[PDB]
Structures are given as C-alpha cells and as structure tokens.
Design a protein around this ligand. Structure first.
Ligand code: ATP
Ligand code: ATP
Ligand code: MG
Ligand code: MG
Ligand code: MG
Ligand code: MG
Ligand code: RB
Ligand code: RB
Ligand code: RB
Ligand code: RB
Lengths: 326, 324
C-alpha cells in the first residue's frame, strides 16, 4: 500500500474522549497505512509515539506542540479529521486543511459549520421543506421567547454527544437549563420535546450521489439518549434494520438524502430523525459521526453490505475524487 | 494596553487587487502599530519588506512562503484579515486563526462561510422572514431550471466585486452566463433581475447585536454596479443619507440588524439592499467590505459620526472583546 493517511483525533471540544474512542475504531479497520495525530485538550498536538500513548490512555489533557504543529504534511495523501464537535467538526480544521491544500475526508468548511449549528441547520432544512421540530434560538444574556409549551429540550447550539442538553418540564426550570447550555456555547436552542418518540438514524456515504444505509433505531431506558447512554457498553439498544414498516424506512432514507444535498455535505453524514405519532422530523445531521464501539454509523453501513474496512476505504477515495474535481 | 495589529491582504480570490487597495485604506487610518502580510495570487505569503513592496505594486502574483508562513504570530495582539472573497472571507482563513488562538477582526467561521454563499445566505434569511429576490442555485454540469421570466442576474455563488456576474435578457444567453460564473465557483445562483432598481447599503458594527450606520444609496450610469463602476473614481455616487421616506430608512436598518443577528456576524458587515416598486429586498451581507478609495463602508459610518480611525479602533476592540 503506497497510500498514507493522517488521522487527527482528540480535540478541545467536550467530545475529546469520544473522538479518541472513534480513532481506535478507525485505526482498527482502515486498510491504508495511517498515522495518528492527537489534539490534546489544551490545543497542543501530540505526534508519533506520544499520540499512540495518548490513545491508550483514552484522554490527552496536555499536548506538546503549539498549533500549527511541525507535522510533515507532505507524507500524507489524505487527512482524516476525526474531531467531533467545536474546532473539529464545525469547519475550523477544514479551513486549515483547505489552505494546506490537502485532500481530506468529509464535509467542507460551509457545510461543516452549518451542520454543527442546530439553529442554522434547522432554518435551512425548514426552508427546503424538511420537517423539523418547533424550536427557537436563544442568545446568552437575552431573555427567551418560547412560542410553545413545555416539555422542552434545551441544547447548546453547537453541541454533540448530548453534552449540555436538558429535558425541561416546567418553565421555571428553563433558566437553569439555558444556563447549563451557555457553559458550552453563546447560543442555545429550545425545542419542543416529542414524547413518546422513536429515534431513527441513517448513514450517508458519497459526494454528489449520496447513498443511504439501512435505517437503524436506538432504544434505551434512560430519560433521553444521553452521554452515559451513548457510550456505556450495553446501555443503548441498537436495532438494525429499525423494526418499522418498509415504507416509513423508505421515507426516512429519502429525507436523509434530500437533507444531505440541501446542506451541501460530502464524504459522510449520520442523519438523526424522530418519529412521533406517525410523523417524521429530521433531528440533526452529523458530518463526523462517532466510530466508537457503541456508534451507529459503521454498524448501519455493515448492515447495508459495506464492511468496516471498505467503508473507510470509500471515505478516503471520496476525499480524493472531490479534490481532483476541484 | 499594548496593541500591535497584523493586517493580512491580497489572497487567491479574484478580489486580490481590491484587497490590496483595501489594505492601503486601513493602513492609512488605523491608529495602532500595524504590520502587513500579503498572500500572493499563487497562495504563497510575503512578509515584512516584500509585503510593502507588493502593496506598492498593487498586485502580487507570486509569493515567497508556502502556507503556513513562518510568521512571528506571538508579536501580534490582533489579526485583521482583509482578504475579500474565496479563501479569505468565507471561513477558511478564519478557521486557521481560530486554531492559532489569536483574536481576529470580523466574522467567525460559520457567519463568514454563510454570508459568502449567495444561495445559503438567502435560504437562511428567507426562512427568517427577510425579503430576498426569487433565486435558484445551479451546480456546475447540471442543467439549470429557472422558474421565473428573464431578465436574470447570474452569479458565482461565492463572488464579490461583481466578478463573473451577467445580466441575462434572453434564455439563449443563459448558457454563456453560467459558463462565465462557473469559472469562479462550482455553484452559481440565478436571480430574478429587479428592473429598474435602487441600491441601498447599511454598515453594521458590533458583535452579533450590531449598530447600524445611516443608509446610503449608490447611483451610477452603467447597466449595473459592475467591477469597473465599483472601483473607478467618480463612477459611483454615494447619496448619504439615502433619499427615503422615514419608515423606509428604519425598515432597512432593522432588516440589516436582524440578518446580522440571525447569521451571528461579529465585527462588521456591509449589508446591501434593493428597492423596487416600493418593496425592499436584502441582497447580501459582506463581512469583509471594501476599504478602497471608492468603497462605501467607511463613508457610511463617517456619516453616522464614526470617523475612519475610530471605526478601525472599534473593529480591533471588538475582536478582543469577543476573544475575552
Ligand atoms: N425535540 C426533542 N424531542 C425528544 N427528544 C429529544 C429532542 N431533542 C433532543 N432529544 C433527545 O436528546 C438526544 C440528543 O439530542 P441531539 O441529537 O440534538 O444531540 P447531539 O448531542 O447533537 O447528538 P449526537 O451525539 O448524535 O451528535 C436525542 O437522541 C434525543 O434522545
Ligand atoms: N437580482 C438583482 N436584480 C437587480 N440587480 C442586481 C441583482 N443582483 C445583482 N444586481 C446588480 O449586480 C450588482 C452586484 O451584485 P451582488 O451584490 O450580488 O455582487 P457582489 O460581487 O457580492 O457585490 P460586492 O462587490 O458588493 O460584494 C448589484 O450591486 C446590482 O447592481
Ligand atoms: Mg449531533
Ligand atoms: Mg443526535
Ligand atoms: Mg458581495
Ligand atoms: Mg453587493
Ligand atoms: Rb451536528
Ligand atoms: Rb423557528
Ligand atoms: Rb458576501
Ligand atoms: Rb430558492
């Protein structure tokens, strides 16, 4: 194999540890020679053997090299950013790689920024006619104006892994939920809580001609699909294909591919939906989905006949056929 | 407080030369010690004396240092990207500066990326209830479907300075218009042309919650506000305050601030509008407006009591305010 890939994991967002878990899964299956670079929680980079050491430790609070790191970029044919959340999944790292001129996996600057913002992505989806849950944006230090009645879900606008998210039952509890959310972002969303709800997820793979995996369903005992439920082995019930009538599954895949085109994604996405009283809502799109042992995206494509090494090989090829097209 | 500013100008977009002219304006009025760095048209950087030489020449086709440059970033307290268009105004350079950790002037990654894309920004604004002209996007290689009558304006979705824009009067000319646009972007927009039309502009200054300048109106003799009209001395007249009914000036300023807040813009924008048959349309936001001798943003704020050195002072201060 002449191909050489640079995997970047870790990061400064609250999903630092999740990103390192995703790295273990990708490195276990990727069929190209791949080097790891870790972004420690302080923003400094660990390279070579120190990055592997940090991987085993499953967290890297302190790094060695201030950005930009002394990394030999010219050794790598493709860069694979596996950095969930702010400063990784939101276009920041993508902007750096664009300036380096390196082919890289996944969505570009604008689609990455847009899909990380739960307010702006919903505006664009709603404008395209995609159903989304009623919501309002709230900015820090500005009084909330919620045209609908609780229960609410309150989120930092740029969150992942359910960090900073509250299920809010009483309006009295809103200001506490917003204040938690504002620990992670200057902007929060307040959404109408669907209850009861089923949670459906579908993977997409492609640049211009996205293709959808089978639909999967998540079930759990907790009050919502929270951080502990997402990453504690065994806690989440991952059902593939979703135990749903085939027509609803078809509508979910159609909506996912529509949203992928509307939001301008490339490389990959995991698209999350809610199903409530027969109605589908697109919840969000994640441009760098998790690859942890409890993550849906590699499992969805496995069920669709795309094995884990093949899935990773296709992501790397799509990175190269995007760049060549310019 | 000590304050040393690093100004970056030039860039790889078609607004390269415009950006160097903006740099001349900024350097003439900025009240802080400021060094220039130039991105040449080939993407390589010029530092120190070679950057000032590039600036004097008003164009830098070739640079010295491949990205990322050996620039002594620690010497600067604030970075001021003055790079108009693709790879300077669209979030890419902002993403690098975010990872560098330095305060920097103007909109962040997401607001920069969205305001540069004429299709995406119209989607968001239209959803938020801001009036915008009818439009469609066209991807390179796909057949356009334009569901309204000509005339049209055809544009690269990422353009600035009117580069690659055509007024299309008949369907037979659409193909040539789109081929022109696709030299500059993989996505084009086709908009319903308003005709006749008046053009209004408002400056915004601030972080997310902005303050609006007076409204200015641009007049010119050319068929539209094109590259030559924009940058040739005397071709464009700025009427400030614009001749509007009082309800209309207020509506323009409210719409600008609403769009600014929805998009989450920081630092500055110049927000452009159309007025046709008494109806307002928001045309675009520019997060790195021009500072050339014929540019409107410094004049809009001059008319609202904010002189040029004070405008630049507030932009640098806003960058630090956000960073803290
Ligand atoms: N409007 C809602 N109604 C019901 N449940 C919700 C709603 N919004 C969020 N949730 C619950 O919170 C979970 C996380 O919300 P969301 O998908 O917005 O967060 P995330 O942090 O972006 O997720 P991921 O880790 O997939 O990136 C959902 O899986 C669901 O359990
Ligand atoms: N829909 C339209 N109807 C009428 N005139 C138009 C329309 N779109 C563009 N124009 C004309 O084309 C000019 C440039 O359009 P636009 O503002 O979209 O380009 P830009 O390159 O982003 O401008 P800037 O240099 O201000 O960034 C307008 O100022 C106007 O003269
Ligand atoms: Mg998410
Ligand atoms: Mg989710
Ligand atoms: Mg513009
Ligand atoms: Mg304009
Ligand atoms: Rb997301
Ligand atoms: Rb809304
Ligand atoms: Rb713009
Ligand atoms: Rb449209």
């Amino acid at each position: 194999m002449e191909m050489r890939v640079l995997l970047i994991a870790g990061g400064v967002s609250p999903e630092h540890e999740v990103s390192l878990l995703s790295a273990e899964g990708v490195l276990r299956h990727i069929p190209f020679p791949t080097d790891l670079a870790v972004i420690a929680q302080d923003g400094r980079w660990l390279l070579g053997e120190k990055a592997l050491t940090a991987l085993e430790a499953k967290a890297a609070p302190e790094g060695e090299h201030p950005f930009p790191p002394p990394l030999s970029w010219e050794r790598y044919d493709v860069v694979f950013p596996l950095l969930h959340g702010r400063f990784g999944e939101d276009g920041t790292v993508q902007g750096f790689l664009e300036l380096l001129g390196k082919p890289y996996v996944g969505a570009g600057v604008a689609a990455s920024a847009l899909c990380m913002d739960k307010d702006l992505s919903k505006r664009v989806l709603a404008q395209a006619g995609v159903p989304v849950v009623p919501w309002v944006a709230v900015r820090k230090g500005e009084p909330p104006v919620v045209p609908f009645d609780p229960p609410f879900f309150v989120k930092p606008a740029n969150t992942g892994s359910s960090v900073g998210i509250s299920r809010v039952e009483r309006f009295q509890d809103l200001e506490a939920a917003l204040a938690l959310a504002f620990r992670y972002d200057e902007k929060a969303v307040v959404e109408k809580a669907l209850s009861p709800v089923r949670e459906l997820e579908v993977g997409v793979l492609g640049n211009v001609f996205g293709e959808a995996s089978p639909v999967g369903e998540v079930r759990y005992e907790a009050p919502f699909y929270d951080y502990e439920t997402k990453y504690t082995p065994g806690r989440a019930e991952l059902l593939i294909p979703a135990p749903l009538d085939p027509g609803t599954q078809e509508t979910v895949q159609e909506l996912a591919l529509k949203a992928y085109k509307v939001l301008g994604v490339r490389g990959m996405a995991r698209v999350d939906f809610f199903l409530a009283e027969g109605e589908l809502y697109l919840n969000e799109l994640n441009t760098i989905p998790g690859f942890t042992p409890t993550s849906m995206y590699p499992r969805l494509f496995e069920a669709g006949g795309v094995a884990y090494p093949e899935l990773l090989r296709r992501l790397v090829e799509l990175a190269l056929t995007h760049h060549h097209h310019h």
